[PDB]
Design a protein around this ligand. Structure first.
Ligand SMILES: Nc1ncnc2c1ncn2[C@@H]1O[C@H](COP(=O)(O)OP(=O)(O)OP(=O)(O)O)[C@@H](O)[C@H]1O
Ligand SMILES: [Cl-]
Ligand SMILES: [Cl-]
Ligand SMILES: [K+]
Ligand SMILES: [K+]
Ligand SMILES: [Mg+2]
Length: 378
């Protein structure tokens, strides 16, 4: 007490606390309401969150991310073997369990996924402590609805290692529905669709709620579709533009690509509220400045197939839940990527004009609902 709600996200984490009948989403030391699920190791220190993501480009083999993709899994799991090929850090096998291997202070170290996630949770715990001016111990932590018992157990363990008393592990879509008060009893069942597009995954969940009890009717999605893919499309676009203007290809310069990606992600966010965004990077490659811009229309065209494709999982989830689109009582947007206007248009159009629940920052809705539930369990 106070107990907190924590969304331990694949790419960003968020912590909230319910007090005086209101949820407060807590800003970190940099004033950010969400924090990168990154941890880095150097010759002298361990960095977590914003501090870790800010040096990823210069320290690729020792900056860990995506621990959520390893948590609770066996080393021989096809998913792990597939994902490992794409990470710049090493994943080793310890008696059948995956561990990330890094260098810290000149020595080789290895950590279980739950230890890496415990570092992220320690950061979220401290963020809440700085805001509350009191020690934080009890917490509700969320996980994807498809997580199995081992993945739920390892997530709870990450919390315990961080010094938290995990009151309960609840599903992300359920937490999002709770944020909007859809758990309240209205004397009849209600069907709710959660459309969750984050930084690296896309989850569609259909919930049936009655008497405060949740039932996951169906889930669909793509574990390799998120905001990072839209950033990739923009990066490729600008590498091509720089090549045309300067007859130089920056593709093989890791730092150049990173600075460009960062500017693209920032420009993308601006495009959700404005129709154009400027990209200005000083000395991007060989001392050449890269000052350009991108319109919302071009950003939408660069990603047209990926945006439209989000509707397939929606149709499949409806089919698996044995529900027609007209039987959905509420549609809830979750994940930072749902702030993109074109995605909202596509989903609303698919639902024949039905309004979307989007008043709660989508990238905060999971933590918001977790905080409400944590207070209820406290
Ligand atoms: N205003 C915005 N417009 C567009 N995209 C945005 C905006 N704000 C944030 N994003 C994107 O949202 C993503 C992060 O979403 P969120 O914080 O919900 O991630 P997450 O739940 O950790 O993701 P994952 O699905 O990988 O678990 C990033 O790709 C970020 O660029
Ligand atoms: Cl911080
Ligand atoms: Cl459209
Ligand atoms: K998140
Ligand atoms: K997601
Ligand atoms: Mg998420």
């Amino acid at each position: 007490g106070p107990a907190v709600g924590i969304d331990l996200g694949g790419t960003y984490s968020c912590v909230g606390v319910f007090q005086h009948g209101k949820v407060e989403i807590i800003a970190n030391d940099q004033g950010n309401r969400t924090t990168p699920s990154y941890v880095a190791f150097t010759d002298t220190e361990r960095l977590i969150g914003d501090a870790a993501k800010n040096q990823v480009a210069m320290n690729p083999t020792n900056t860990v991310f995506d621990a959520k993709r390893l948590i609770g899994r066996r080393f021989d799991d096809a998913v792990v073997q597939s994902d490992m090929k794409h990470w710049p850090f090493m994943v080793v096998n310890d008696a059948g369990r995956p561990k990330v291997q890094v260098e810290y202070k000149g020595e080789t170290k290895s950590f279980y996924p739950e230890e890496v996630s415990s570092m992220v949770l320690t950061k979220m715990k401290e963020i809440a402590e700085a805001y509350l001016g009191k020690t934080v111990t009890n917490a509700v932590v969320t996980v994807p609805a498809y997580f199995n018992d081992s993945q739920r157990q390892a997530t709870k363990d990450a919390g315990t290692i961080a010094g938290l008393n995990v009151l309960r592990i609840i599903n992300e879509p359920t937490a999002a529905a709770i944020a909007y008060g859809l758990d309240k009893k209205v004397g009849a069942e209600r069907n709710v669709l959660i459309f969750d597009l984050g930084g690296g995954t896309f989850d569609v969940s259909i919930l049936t709620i009655e008497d405060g009890i949740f039932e996951v009717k169906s889930t669909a999605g793509d574990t390799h579709l998120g905001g990072e893919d839209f950033d990739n499309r923009m990066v490729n676009h600008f590498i091509a533009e720089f090549k045309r203007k300067h007859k130089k290809d920056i593709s093989e310069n890791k730092r150049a690509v990173r600075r460009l990606r960062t500017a693209c992600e920032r420009a993308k966010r601006t495009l959700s509220s404005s129709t154009q965004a400027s990209i200005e990077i000083d000395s991007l490659y060989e001392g050449i400045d890269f000052y350009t811009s991108i319109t919302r229309a071009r950003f939408e065209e660069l990603n047209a197939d990926l945006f439209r494709g989000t509707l397939d999982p929606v149709e499949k989830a409806l089919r698996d839940a044995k529900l027609d689109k007209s039987q959905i009582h509420d549609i809830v947007l979750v994940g930072g990527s749902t702030r993109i206007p074109k995605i909202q248009k596509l989903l609303q159009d698919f639902f024949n004009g039905k309004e979307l629940n989007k008043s709660i920052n989508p990238d905060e809705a999971v933590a918001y609902g977790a905080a409400v539930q944590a207070a209820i369990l406290s």
